[PDB]
From Swiss-Prot:
Record's GO cellular component terms: Nrd1 complex; nucleus
Major subcellular location class: nucleus
GO aspect biological process, one term: antisense RNA transcript catabolic process
Domain RRM: 38-108
Annotated compartments: Nucleus
Source species: Saccharomyces cerevisiae (strain ATCC 204508 / S288c)
Record gene name: NRD1
Keywords assigned: Nucleus, Phosphoprotein, RNA-binding
GO molecular function, one term: mRNA binding
Full protein stretch here: 302 to 463 of 575
Name of the protein described by the UniProt record: Protein NRD1
Record lineage: Eukaryota, Fungi, Dikarya, Ascomycota, Saccharomycotina
Length: 162
């Protein structure tokens, strides 16, 4: 498992507490939902940079929740606790290029072909989500719908997937 803080809960006593914003977009086609990524793809990762090193360097911009790192592939998938935090990294982290890290929107939920990589969201037809995906979307600790059912046009932040 790739979560940095095992078994944590999205509760007010956790410093990682974040709200779960949900909205509705009438323009989506039938049976489609919109999911904002909380996952960054980081390329240019040096050989001796580990998961906590990435969390440590990012901390002034965002609190890292999970990291899937592969040094042999020079990359990591880094999930942060909120969409706002992910945007803050892309806006403000390493913009001069003092570090070799190269950061962009990643995909942590749903099919890769549904992702708009420029804007960091996916428009996903619900027939392409597993029952597990649908359950995660409604019941996850961070992101998801906070109990609200999945309907055409619902918009939410990337849900945790176990």
């Amino acid at each position: 498992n790739h979560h940095l803080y095992p078994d944590e809960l999205n509760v007010s006593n956790n410093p990682h507490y974040r709200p779960k914003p949900v909205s509705y977009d009438s323009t989506l086609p039938p049976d489609h939902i919109k999911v904002y990524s909380r996952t960054l793809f980081i390329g240019g990762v040096p050989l001796n940079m580990k998961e906590w090193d990435l969390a440590n360097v990012l901390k002034p911009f965002a609190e890292v929740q999970s990291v899937i790192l592969n040094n042999s592939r020079k990359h990591a998938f880094v999930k942060v606790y909120s969409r706002h935090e992910a945007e803050n990294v892309l806006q403000n982290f390493n913009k001069d290029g003092a570090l070799p890290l190269r950061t962009r929107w990643g995909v942590g939920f749903g099919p890769r072909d549904c992702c708009d990589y420029q804007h960091g969201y996916s428009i996903i037809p619900m027939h392409r989500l597993t029952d597990a995906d649908k359950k995660w979307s409604v019941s996850a600790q961070w992101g998801g719908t906070s109990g609200q059912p999945l309907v055409t046009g619902i918009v939410f932040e990337e849900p945790d997937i176990i």
